[PDB]
Design a binder for this molecule. Structure first.
Ligand SMILES: C[C@H](CCC(=O)NCCS(=O)(=O)O)[C@H]1CC[C@H]2[C@@H]3CC[C@@H]4C[C@H](O)CC[C@]4(C)[C@H]3C[C@H](O)[C@]12C
Ligand SMILES: C[C@H](CCC(=O)NCCS(=O)(=O)O)[C@H]1CC[C@H]2[C@@H]3CC[C@@H]4C[C@H](O)CC[C@]4(C)[C@H]3C[C@H](O)[C@]12C
Lengths: 132, 89
């Protein structure tokens, strides 16, 4: 069974505030299992910088050629103000609710160099990931 | 759980339950980008109630991805100008 890697980054802005996320996503898929690493830098005017490292793994389930589901076995959340020293952090609701639940990923385009998906962040987001 | 493809022209793919908004935004995007001599390989846009996201795939297969949350709906002109500015810079 070969391993396939998917990597992307995105920036989140809010039209009604200064909240911003800079997010890198790294996903590896082997068979029906996946490992995900999500690195977040969180900014806002009323508070100083903040980093989050979200490590998870679980089952990826193929329903159609374009309909997949990610069901996490576990997710760990680390936080810190400097990427050098991060420390464990109790899972927020938006993380713990993803465990033992099938989260929707819909593929809209597939090439050998990238894939375009609608997925469940922010209750609906479209993004392109580079294929490795 | 996601809007269906409601507008597809040239390199633009817009996923939204609102056809009028989809076509208005899609044409505004093609007009503004062509005027600046920007021709993406593909441009994907998703319009939700409270969230807008897009993926810009450049000629070199590199991607730029953005999410914009808004408490009140924006008209196609503002959404187009936001997307184009993020792509431009
Ligand atoms: C808990 C964190 C800080 C929240 C905060 O700043 N609280 C103070 C303001 S308040 O006064 O208390 O409201 C936030 C900041 C960024 C978030 C991720 C963004 C990507 C992704 C989006 C998906 O939709 C759900 C999963 C997802 C991985 C998210 C997990 C978690 O939610 C994160 C880490
Ligand atoms: C975008 C709409 C779907 C909205 C919706 O409700 N999505 C499911 C949500 S839910 O599951 O119900 O919750 C769809 C529904 C009807 C479509 C027109 C049909 C005639 C004509 C056919 C031509 O080929 C292209 C132009 C044309 C005017 C079309 C434009 C657009 O495609 C329209 C408006």
């Amino acid at each position: 069974d070969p391993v396939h890697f998917y990597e992307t980054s995105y920036k989140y802005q809010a039209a009604d505030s200064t909240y911003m996320h800079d997010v890198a996503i790294n996903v590896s898929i082997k068979g029906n299992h996946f490992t995900s690493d999500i690195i977040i830098r969180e900014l806002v005017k009323s508070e100083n910088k903040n980093y989050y490292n979200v490590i998870g793994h679980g089952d990826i389930i193929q329903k159609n050629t374009h309909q997949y589901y990610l069901n996490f076995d576990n997710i760990d959340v680390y936080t810190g103000t400097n990427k050098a020293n991060m420390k464990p952090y109790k899972e927020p609701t938006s993380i713990s609710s993803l465990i033992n639940k099938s989260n929707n990923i819909r593929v809209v385009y597939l090439s050998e160099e990238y894939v375009v998906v609608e997925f469940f962040f922010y209750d609906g987001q479209i993004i392109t990931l580079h294929r490795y | 759980d996601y809007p269906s493809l409601s507008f597809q022209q040239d390199y633009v793919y817009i996923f939204s339950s609102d056809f009028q908004l989809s076509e208005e935004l899609g044409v505004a995007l093609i007009n503004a980008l062509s005027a600046k001599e920007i021709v993406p390989e593909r441009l994907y846009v998703m319009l939700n109630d409270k969230t807008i996201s897009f993926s810009f795939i450049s000629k070199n297969k590199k991607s730029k991805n953005r999410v914009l949350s808004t408490e009140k709906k924006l008209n196609y002109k503002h959404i187009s100008e936001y997307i184009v500015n993020e792509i431009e810079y």
